[PDB]
Design an enzyme around this catalytic site. Sequence first.
Site, mmCIF file in Angstrom:
data_model
loop_
_atom_site.group_PDB
_atom_site.id
_atom_site.type_symbol
_atom_site.label_atom_id
_atom_site.label_comp_id
_atom_site.label_asym_id
_atom_site.label_seq_id
_atom_site.Cartn_x
_atom_site.Cartn_y
_atom_site.Cartn_z
ATOM 1 N N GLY A 1 0.858 -1.168 -0.018
ATOM 2 C CA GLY A 1 0.076 0.045 0.070
ATOM 3 C C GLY A 1 0.790 0.993 -0.107
ATOM 4 C CE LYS A 2 3.440 6.725 -3.354
ATOM 5 N NZ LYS A 2 4.781 6.575 -2.975
ATOM 6 N N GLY A 3 0.117 5.210 1.655
ATOM 7 C CA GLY A 3 -0.672 6.321 1.939
ATOM 8 C C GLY A 3 -0.072 7.495 1.592
ATOM 9 C CE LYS B 1 0.873 5.156 6.808
ATOM 10 N NZ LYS B 1 -0.478 5.386 7.475
ATOM 11 C CB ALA C 1 4.169 6.123 5.044
ATOM 12 C CD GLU C 2 7.087 3.367 -1.057
ATOM 13 O OE1 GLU C 2 8.132 2.473 -0.630
ATOM 14 O OE2 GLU C 2 7.037 3.720 -2.446
ATOM 15 C CB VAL C 3 1.656 0.208 3.773
ATOM 16 C CG1 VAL C 3 1.336 -1.084 4.868
ATOM 17 C CG2 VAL C 3 1.201 1.480 4.337
ATOM 18 C CG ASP D 1 -7.383 11.781 4.056
ATOM 19 O OD1 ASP D 1 -8.238 12.004 3.082
ATOM 20 O OD2 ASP D 1 -6.131 11.520 3.596
HETATM 21 C C1 LIG Z 1 0.797 2.744 11.820
HETATM 22 O O1 LIG Z 1 1.182 1.732 11.098
HETATM 23 C C2 LIG Z 1 0.584 1.299 10.052
HETATM 24 C C3 LIG Z 1 0.724 0.225 9.159
HETATM 25 C C4 LIG Z 1 0.079 0.200 8.071
HETATM 26 C C5 LIG Z 1 -0.997 0.795 7.891
HETATM 27 C C6 LIG Z 1 -1.704 0.802 6.599
HETATM 28 C C7 LIG Z 1 -2.128 -0.344 5.896
HETATM 29 C C8 LIG Z 1 -2.003 -1.680 6.301
HETATM 30 C C9 LIG Z 1 -2.153 -2.173 7.465
HETATM 31 C C10 LIG Z 1 -2.140 -3.584 7.702
HETATM 32 N N1 LIG Z 1 -2.398 -4.480 6.745
HETATM 33 C C11 LIG Z 1 -2.352 -4.252 5.458
HETATM 34 N N2 LIG Z 1 -2.851 -5.173 4.585
HETATM 35 C C12 LIG Z 1 -2.978 -5.247 3.258
HETATM 36 C C13 LIG Z 1 -3.072 -6.475 2.542
HETATM 37 O O2 LIG Z 1 -2.665 -3.981 2.725
HETATM 38 C C14 LIG Z 1 -2.091 -2.723 5.114
HETATM 39 N N3 LIG Z 1 -2.878 0.048 4.772
HETATM 40 C C15 LIG Z 1 -2.774 1.293 4.667
HETATM 41 C C16 LIG Z 1 -3.215 2.414 3.444
HETATM 42 C C17 LIG Z 1 -3.018 3.466 3.641
HETATM 43 C C18 LIG Z 1 -2.491 3.886 5.001
HETATM 44 N N4 LIG Z 1 -1.849 3.207 5.785
HETATM 45 C C19 LIG Z 1 -2.167 1.779 5.706
HETATM 46 C C20 LIG Z 1 -1.386 1.935 8.685
HETATM 47 N N5 LIG Z 1 -0.543 1.999 9.742
#
Ligand SMILES: COc1ccc(-c2c(-c3ccnc(NC(C)=O)c3)[nH]c3cccnc23)cn1
Length: 295
Positions: free
Chosen positions: A12-14, A33, A17-19, A135
């Site tokens: 993923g991509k917020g 993240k 940050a990248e995930v 958001d």
């Molecule tokens: C504080 O740390 C985090 C770590 C990850 C995320 C996070 C995740 C995330 C989390 C758990 N599992 C997954 N699983 C699959 C398959 O994507 C994706 N997706 C996102 C999309 C946009 C922004 N943040 C996130 C948010 N906060």
Amino acid sequence: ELLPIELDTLVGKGRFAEVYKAKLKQFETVAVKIFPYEEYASWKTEKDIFSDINLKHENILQFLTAEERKTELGKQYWLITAFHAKGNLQEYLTRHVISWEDLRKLGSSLARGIAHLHSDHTPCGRPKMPIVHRDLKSSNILVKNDLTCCLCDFGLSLRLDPTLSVDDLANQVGTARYMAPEVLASAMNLENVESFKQTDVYSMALVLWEMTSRCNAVGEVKDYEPPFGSKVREHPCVASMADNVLADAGRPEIPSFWLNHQGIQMVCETLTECWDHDPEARLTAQCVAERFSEL
Ligand SMILES: COc1ccc(-c2c(-c3ccnc(NC(C)=O)c3)[nH]c3cccnc23)cn1
Ligand SMILES: [Mg+2]
């Protein structure tokens, strides 16, 4: 001091940050993240929110720890949490048609999560700092294995601190597509921070519509499309959104046939109150959670 983590896949991509899906040697699967140095302030904002002992809740992403990671050519800032294999709600609804039971579980858990975030007390009674997401959208709501939601992506979030100044509340963030009409209008009532909770409820109404739009309980289901999908560009500007949401009082379409199902009818009536032009007319997230418990 650093955890033994091996990064596996970019999932993923917020906004900041990248995930990554990663392996934590203990191996447990975790999400990592990764914030570059220039987004340190967003890493710190999320770390501060997740570090509050009063935040922990089944509908809030489970936080493990924050780390600072030196790289060969700089430094990264990491947040490590539980990993949800089903991923984000937007992708889940894109790939799947959901049942009425699924909609009940997903919608009620989203309302419970937002009500908890907004609450000035823990489920037991201790004072808690209210948080406004700012958001909220289907792409940053996670689907747990049991088909309940959990919230994350708090980089733009605001702790409703009594020290907040008027000249601090007034300094147009978030995703234009999910902005409430008062946000698009730059007309938020800054006389009370309750205005910010009302903007989250509006965004939550759009997400409830997305879930409803993919629920087979209505019968014929269209392919998933984001709210206002055919009305504006893929990445719409605030002006084009204001033409729809504010000027035209436009909302995603609720075809009359959806209302033939008693449960879908209740959900549509509830989310319609939640996207009212007037923020003071919207239900609170706690009201929505109560409406769902009545189903
Ligand atoms: C504080 O740390 C985090 C770590 C990850 C995320 C996070 C995740 C995330 C989390 C758990 N599992 C997954 N699983 C699959 C398959 O994507 C994706 N997706 C996102 C999309 C946009 C922004 N943040 C996130 C948010 N906060
Ligand atoms: Mg910058």
